[PDB]
Design a protein around this nucleic acid. Structure first.
Ligand SMILES: [Mg+2]
Ligand SMILES: [Mg+2]
Ligand SMILES: [Mg+2]
Ligand SMILES: [Mg+2]
Ligand SMILES: [Mg+2]
Ligand SMILES: [Mg+2]
Ligand SMILES: [Mg+2]
Ligand SMILES: [Mg+2]
Ligand SMILES: [Mg+2]
Ligand SMILES: [Mg+2]
Ligand SMILES: [Mg+2]
Ligand SMILES: [Mg+2]
Ligand SMILES: [Mg+2]
Ligand SMILES: [Mg+2]
Ligand SMILES: [Mg+2]
Ligand SMILES: [Mg+2]
Ligand SMILES: [Mg+2]
Ligand SMILES: [Mg+2]
Ligand SMILES: [Mg+2]
Ligand SMILES: [Mg+2]
Ligand SMILES: [Mg+2]
Ligand SMILES: [Mg+2]
Ligand SMILES: [Mg+2]
Ligand SMILES: [Mg+2]
Ligand SMILES: [Mg+2]
Ligand SMILES: [Mg+2]
Ligand SMILES: [Mg+2]
Ligand SMILES: [Mg+2]
Ligand SMILES: [Mg+2]
Ligand SMILES: [Mg+2]
Ligand SMILES: [Mg+2]
Ligand SMILES: [Mg+2]
Ligand SMILES: [Mg+2]
Ligand SMILES: [Mg+2]
Ligand SMILES: [Mg+2]
Ligand SMILES: [Mg+2]
Ligand SMILES: [Mg+2]
Ligand SMILES: [Mg+2]
Ligand SMILES: [Zn+2]
Lengths: 159, 105, 61, 213
RNA sequence: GUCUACGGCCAUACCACCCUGAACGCGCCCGAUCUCGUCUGAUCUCGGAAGCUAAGCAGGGUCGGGCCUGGUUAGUACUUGGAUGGGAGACCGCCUGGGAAUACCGGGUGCUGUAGGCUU
RNA sequence: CAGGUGGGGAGUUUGACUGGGGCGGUACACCUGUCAAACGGUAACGCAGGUGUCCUAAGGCGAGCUCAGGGAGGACAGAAACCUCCCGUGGAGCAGAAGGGCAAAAGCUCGCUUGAUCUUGAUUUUCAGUACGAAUACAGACCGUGAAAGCGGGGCCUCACGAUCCUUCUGACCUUUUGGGUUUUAAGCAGGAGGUGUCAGAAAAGUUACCACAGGGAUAACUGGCUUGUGGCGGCCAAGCGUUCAUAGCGACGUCGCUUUUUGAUCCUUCGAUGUCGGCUCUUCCUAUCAUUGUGAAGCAGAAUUCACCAAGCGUUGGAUUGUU
RNA sequence: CGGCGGGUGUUGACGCGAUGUGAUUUCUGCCCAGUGCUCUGAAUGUCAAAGUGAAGAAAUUCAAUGAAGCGCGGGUAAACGGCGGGAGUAACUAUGACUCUCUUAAGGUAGCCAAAUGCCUCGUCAUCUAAUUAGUGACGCGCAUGAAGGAUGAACGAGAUU
RNA sequence: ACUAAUCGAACCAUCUAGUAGCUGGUUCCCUCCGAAGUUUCCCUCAGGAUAGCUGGCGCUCUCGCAGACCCGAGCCACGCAGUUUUAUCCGGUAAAGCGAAUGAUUAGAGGUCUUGGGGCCGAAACGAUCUCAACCUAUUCUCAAACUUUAAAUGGGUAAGAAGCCCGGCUCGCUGGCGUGGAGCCGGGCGUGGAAUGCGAGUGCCUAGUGGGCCACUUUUGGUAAGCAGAACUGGCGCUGCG
RNA sequence: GCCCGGAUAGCUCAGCUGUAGAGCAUCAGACUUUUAAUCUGAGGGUCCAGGGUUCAAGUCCCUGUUCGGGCGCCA
RNA sequence: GUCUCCGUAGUGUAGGGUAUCACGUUCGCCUAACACGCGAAAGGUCCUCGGUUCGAAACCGGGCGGAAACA
């Protein structure tokens, strides 16, 4: 019984944030998108041209094509029991760079620097990051103070 | 809707934008020697009654209006069919509208 | 007379019985759908890429 | 021609206010929510008694009107017509519906059963929570037993369980009676109307100098 | 320490009132022959340089409003998973993890890029 | 041979969904908000609504302005006529339903225009990742506007629509038209249109109690079962009635129950059949007791009566009318 | 099926053929707008084939002419059928003898009735009974009576009722 | 009505083994694998087609196979995941709010204007100023599936390397102030194989049955409710015995 | 779809490219001693709208609006 | 039980910009007196409550009373 309209249920999805209406800031247009970089599809509603469909809002994809005003993005879409890679043309107002890739690139650059330093000197270093290990043994000083005795409080009917 | 009797638009034969005279396309009469009409007449001859469906279930109230364009260049009388959306009332070259006017009593 | 209209019950189990496989990623993604002007210039660059082979080999040497 | 309240006792539906989608709503039975000397100042009536619900349920507007009338009559009898101020802290904003069925011997004569079952508005109820105040009475400190008895009588007009509480707040304000008088003395509270205005130590100094003068 | 031109983020920048502004500048200001626009040289366009910081603008101030950021609210509300837990129910408690928002109370009140000026 | 008449006769059809079917409605093709449980998807004859249009501008550029409302003034003039100032984050307008979006905008007023044009592919939406429809980003022409950057291939976005076959029109000094040639004609190739609203698209009126068949407890009419709105019978509070006095006897406003002796709701059993109203006859059971036994209370003097308790042992009738209960 | 074939017909309007109503008595009202039926064409609208004229090289196209029928116009209700409203109006109110109108054409006449026809309804009144949703008699704005069928009336009935 | 016990169209033979989306039946054993009642379209709703779920047949690869007996002699598989972790985005539900917008809504208080009623003696300048209204201001009670500043828990996407990183060089008709930008290509060097856990993966063909479901916790819509009707999530029954 | 017809004071009907009329309605006068009846006068044209042939048009020609006839019917 | 319609001088009544007619009543004209006729006056807080706008009998919402149609 649900309509198949392209923008059904997007009432808050494409609405602007509070006190952030009006002119689109120009750094969004000044961003540079190459082929192969990773972008988050947001989908603001001030620009009605080149809008992504609501199923791609909040998704992340890789740029494969660059045009005058838009980019082509290869974004995964799960359709029932299969995930298929869809190519979508999105104007640059509705996308932004993804920092998930950038954090990994920083880690790679630091890893290569550390490996070069280790090979230069001769000291081995742990390169793989590890899950949070169990806390080691330590001493807790009382500083000449008895720890404060805590007790549950009596019940009272506030209102 | 109201469309003007002339418009400047692309001419396929001229290969460029040219002035065009605009009329309304009207369906021509049936040939009686078109192959489908011949087949229908042969099928209907004899006994058996009606042999093809007769629609009689109309639902649309309008038609898509087709404009017959004609290039006005004397060496190029090339014609074209432009279809516009469905309209109940269509006028060719009617009087244009004005904004700052009163409603007549 | 009347029947059940729609459900997605058991559909998730059906989808996961053979696994929800991601698309098969591989090197050299296809060039279809890319800007025709950029694509025809890439074809020209590939065609004329042969010339300068001597310069490239000398620099490599 | 009203159904028993056992049919609409529980908050089963989402809130259904009277709005531009719900038209044709009969007016609620209760139209008056404040009684007694509403014009009494904040210092006249320092004692506040509350009726608190232990049930997450719906109270009908008719039940609210009946409880209000009962408590008002008892308070008038035991404390005079100007010895108290009563406030019903619940408003019947939730509309309940009825799927009207033809109550005669006949079914083919357009009874239709459950087809098109959505009902017409019937009445309004007040959706109440556990620990929510239903009714409040403020009065002098010597009328505490009368307030308790009035709320005890009013408890019999309601479906669920209710507690009678004596609030530690001063009257109908949100400030404790322990600190209220000294706050008023140090001008942290200004008595206006039946309540008080809290005066923070921020804003223009002109509003501070109209005080202390 | 500031300003001008173009800006980035787009209130910590906004709003109300008051005070101060040296030098450049920015402006107010003078005029309508030409350019150009008007019901109106008010606006716009043009040609200027007598006067002025009165205004704009800049800086500051206000137990200022707002905004921004903390505390409290509060491990509260809500919530993932669990039980042959309680209760006639309504609902509630516990285990296992996560965890807010007002009111109220503090602090702050634009940062900065490019290019070019002024300030002994 | 042609036209008319022609249920005298022939053949056939007489949609679907559906808290049974019919009547009603369209939940049958679509669009907005909600449902919907903070990705997306999600149902009911769920809720509030809308659609089968309108627009040569309400399309495309560019420029200039600021809207609703309010305050204070100004001859007639008043709550509303116009003029002026000030405030005014949009509280207006953008064709329509709603939602989103929008301020030297996307609104209003002008100037010029026809990108609402000619083309090939790719993609998104429903999706089976088919089609239509709608849409997005390009590319190649030819243009419009603007000083220009640019913007524009319809409407700010979400809807406003349609296969095969057939017909009609337009285009290529195009192909074929059958032994060859010319010319009509006809066929074709490409793109518009004439439509299927049951909207992936048959050409379609009833009746049957004279009826038939294949089936269906997937589905109604009678029992039973769940429920108890409605019906019936109780309880709690006690404003009041009771000359006085809440509670001898009653009980408004509220509120809690029980029963399945009413009627509904549902459709679980039964459609290779459970004989369907009432009466007659006959037995048994229940108690929420009309009478009788023993009792308590009274606004119980007696008599009569009323309320309540243990209590179903025993009884509860003869007739007129009506098929009747 | 067919033959100038056959039935009525060995017949001829006091006859054949087709209908409705249903003895006697007494009446059989208004409506020809609708649908039928029928009648005259009065110029006359539409209208096939054939035929005629023109264009064309021909296929073909166009035009003119206009049979029946329909349409137009008369008649027809013992043809099918139909017989509602509204406004004003009499000296108590109330009704409307009277005057106009609307949908079409006419507005239910004489009669009859809670009838085998009336829902409401077990209508109201009288009678019949101790008691009658029954019967009879009467009334009649009659959901939804009614005139080739209405209203009667002896005799008759394995007809229905008291 | 009757027409040979047959009549709302007799009887006999034939077409004829008429058609049936509907009912009934459908014949030996063991072993292995093992469902669906959902999507889209259909004069479709007791049926099909289609995708999904199933089976069979494979094929392409990965790990090594170890020692005649005995006896390893930083570094340890292609790749995958209904899982967590580390980063990074997405959201508008629960809650909360209304002295924040839009709607709804209770009560006082303080004010000065008005087409408020009017108002005790004021036409006279209500000489006066008492009251009720409306309005404004600061407060106040109660709210929202189709309201919202704020805003969870659970959840959705991406990344966590050799297809990576870094150096040079060549091509371009695209772009262009420029040795410009971008893309492609060619060489070279980097291995501590750059979270945890587990598991061998990839790929093709043919394909049956199903397309009536039902139940439970929790979320949830209509309904007074229902062993009612309709959805979401997971599990189950159906297909399953056992305590 | 083709061939035809009509469209007006409040209501109805006739009408000449050279100046729209008649009746019924309204109002006011006339006749009568008076009321009716009767005679007159005044106002009233959704001339169905638009463009044109037109010096002139309600008229004639085309385009729509409904009201209607007779035909005709393969998406 | 629901749907539709209506709640206005005593009565029936029509009806955003301060309520019309007739009867009922009274009075005044006219007559020698009467009847009639003519004219004037009185008489409806518009069912009740709430709401929007300058202002509501009219428009909107709720609730009462009455009459047809369903049920
Ligand atoms: Mg667009
Ligand atoms: Mg099904
Ligand atoms: Mg519910
Ligand atoms: Mg501040
Ligand atoms: Mg917890
Ligand atoms: Mg027949
Ligand atoms: Mg979700
Ligand atoms: Mg969602
Ligand atoms: Mg502009
Ligand atoms: Mg282009
Ligand atoms: Mg279909
Ligand atoms: Mg069943
Ligand atoms: Mg009951
Ligand atoms: Mg008493
Ligand atoms: Mg069922
Ligand atoms: Mg039997
Ligand atoms: Mg049986
Ligand atoms: Mg038996
Ligand atoms: Mg008993
Ligand atoms: Mg006879
Ligand atoms: Mg003729
Ligand atoms: Mg006659
Ligand atoms: Mg009669
Ligand atoms: Mg009768
Ligand atoms: Mg009878
Ligand atoms: Mg008898
Ligand atoms: Mg009788
Ligand atoms: Mg007759
Ligand atoms: Mg057979
Ligand atoms: Mg079909
Ligand atoms: Mg079956
Ligand atoms: Mg939502
Ligand atoms: Mg909430
Ligand atoms: Mg609010
Ligand atoms: Mg269910
Ligand atoms: Mg089964
Ligand atoms: Mg299984
Ligand atoms: Mg089992
Ligand atoms: Zn041309």
């Amino acid at each position: 019984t649900n309509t198949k309209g392209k923008r059904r249920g997007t009432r808050y999805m494409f609405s602007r944030p509070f006190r952030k209406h009006g002119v689109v800031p120009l750094a969004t247009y000044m961003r540079i998108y190459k082929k192969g970089d990773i972008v988050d599809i947001k989908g603001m509603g001030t620009v009605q041209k080149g809008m992504p469909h609501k199923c791609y809002h909040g998704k992340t994809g890789r740029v494969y094509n660059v045009t005058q005003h838009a980019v082509g993005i290869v974004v995964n879409k799960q359709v029932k029991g299969k995930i298929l890679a869809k190519r979508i043309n999105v104007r640059i107002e509705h996308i932004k760079h993804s920092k998930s890739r950038d954090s990994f690139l920083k880690r790679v650059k630091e890893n290569d620097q550390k490996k070069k330093e280790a090979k230069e000197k001769g000291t081995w270093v742990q390169l793989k990051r590890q899950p949070a290990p169990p806390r080691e043994a330590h001493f807790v000083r009382t500083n000449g103070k008895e720890p404060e005795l805590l007790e549950p409080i009596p019940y009272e009917f506030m209102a | 809707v109201n469309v003007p009797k002339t418009r400047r638009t692309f001419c396929k034969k001229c290969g460029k934008h040219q002035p065009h005279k605009v009329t309304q396309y009207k369906k021509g009469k049936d040939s009686l020697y078109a192959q489908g009409k011949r087949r229908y007449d042969r099928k209907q001859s004899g006994y058996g009654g009606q042999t093809k469906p007769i629609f009689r279930k109309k639902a649309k109230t309008t038609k898509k209006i087709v404009l017959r364009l004609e290039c006005v260049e004397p060496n190029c009388r090339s014609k074209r069919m432009l279809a516009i959306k469905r309209c109940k009332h269509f006028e060719l070259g009617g009087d244009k509208k004005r904004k700052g006017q009163v409603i007549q009593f | 007379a009347k029947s059940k209209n729609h459900t997605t019950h058991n559909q998730s189990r059906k989808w996961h019985r053979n696994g929800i496989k991601k698309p098969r990623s591989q090197r050299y993604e296809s060039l279809k759908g890319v800007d025709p002007k950029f694509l025809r210039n890439m074809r020209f660059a590939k065609k004329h890429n042969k010339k300068g082979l001597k310069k490239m080999q000398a620099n490599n040497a | 021609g009203r159904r028993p309240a056992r049919c609409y006792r529980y908050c089963k539906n989402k809130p259904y206010p009277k709005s531009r989608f719900c038209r044709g709503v009969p007016d609620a039975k209760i139209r008056i929510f404040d009684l007694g000397r509403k014009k009494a100042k904040v210092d006249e009536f320092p004692l506040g008694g509350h009726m608190v619900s232990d049930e997450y349920e719906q109270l009908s507007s008719e039940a609210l009107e009946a409880a209000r009338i009962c408590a008002n009559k008892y308070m008038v009898k035991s404390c005079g017509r100007d010895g108290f101020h009563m406030r019903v802290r619940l408003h019947p904003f939730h509309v309940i519906r009825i799927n009207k069925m033809l109550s005669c011997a006949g079914a083919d004569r357009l009874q239709t059963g459950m087809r098109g079952a959505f009902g017409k508005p019937q009445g309004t109820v007040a959706r109440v929570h556990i620990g929510q105040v239903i009714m409040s009475i403020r009065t002098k400190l010597q009328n505490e037993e009368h307030v308790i008895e009035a709320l005890r009588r009013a408890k019999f007009k309601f479906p669920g369980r209710q507690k009678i509480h004596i609030s530690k707040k001063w009257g109908f304000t949100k400030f404790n009676a322990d600190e209220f008088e000294d706050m008023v003395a140090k001008k942290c509270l200004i008595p206006d109307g039946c309540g008080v205005k809290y005066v923070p130590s921020h804003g223009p100094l002109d509003k501070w100098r109209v005080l202390h003068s």
